[PDB]
Amino acid sequence: DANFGRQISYQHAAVHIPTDIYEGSTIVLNELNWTSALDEVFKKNREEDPSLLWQVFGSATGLARYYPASPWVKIDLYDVRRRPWYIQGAASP
Amino acid sequence: VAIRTIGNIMIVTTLLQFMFACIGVQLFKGKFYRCTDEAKSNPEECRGLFILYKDGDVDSPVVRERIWQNSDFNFDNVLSAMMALFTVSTFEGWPA
Numbered sequence A: 001d002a003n004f005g006r007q008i009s010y011q012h013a014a015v016h017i018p019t020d021i022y023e024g025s026t027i028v029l030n031e032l033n034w035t036s037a038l039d040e041v042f043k044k045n046r047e048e049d050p051s052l053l054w055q056v057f058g059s060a061t062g063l064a065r066y067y068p069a070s071p072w073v074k075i076d077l078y079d080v081r082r083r084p085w086y087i088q089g090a091a092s093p
Numbered sequence B: 001v002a003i004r005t006i007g008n009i010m011i012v013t014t015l016l017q018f019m020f021a022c023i024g025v026q027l028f029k030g031k032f033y034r035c036t037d038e039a040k041s042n043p044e045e046c047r048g049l050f051i052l053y054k055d056g057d058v059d060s061p062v063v064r065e066r067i068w069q070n071s072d073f074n075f076d077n078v079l080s081a082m083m084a085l086f087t088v089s090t091f092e093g094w095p096a
């Protein structure tokens, strides 16, 4: 797709889980249910504004769910909870 | 003939080791388990992949699996306790 230097898919959302976090645990699996209802809102937002870039939910459990789906970009050290955009919304200066 | 004379000592020392092994089982039964990364302390969270830093350097990470492993010499039962206690009597690896 254009304005997206990668290959994307609008049919669903991708979920990133950091390496140090084991997917399949009770905390992570319980997070994958109530975050599955975010995909419909993700699609609805893009329909109103087609010129919409990544929209992502950063969980306190660690996983980040973003739309549209796209494969993740050595080893991976990304943690959504340490990103500058997550930190400013988690507290005040 | 020499074995027959020393045959009485080998009965007392085998009884003493057996009693110590039974005591050792009561103390360290199943308590020698540990995870591959020294940050998880039970089998529930000792799963999946973790990031290992080679020689303690923060600039050289590497991905490794974490496994809830058991000690090679342990006190899970009397047979394992006696084998673990025999190696102690030889003074090999007993500090470990």
Ligand SMILES: *[C@@H]1O[C@H](CO)[C@@H](O[C@@H]2O[C@H](CO)[C@@H](O[C@@H]3O[C@H](CO)[C@@H](O)[C@H](O)[C@H]3NC(C)=O)[C@H](O)[C@H]2NC(C)=O)[C@H](O)[C@H]1NC(C)=O
Binding pocket: A033, A034, A035, A036, A037
């Ligand atoms: C977390 O996982 C739950 C278990 O899979 C999901 O809950 C299940 O969702 C199914 C799909 O909606 C439901 O199936 C139908 O639900 C309707 C709505 O009430 C009912 O007609 C029936 O329950 C069912 N229809 C059938 C069987 O023909 C399941 O009922 C429902 N619950 C279960 C399986 O216990 C959750 O959706 C998921 N979390 C989120 C946020 O989606």
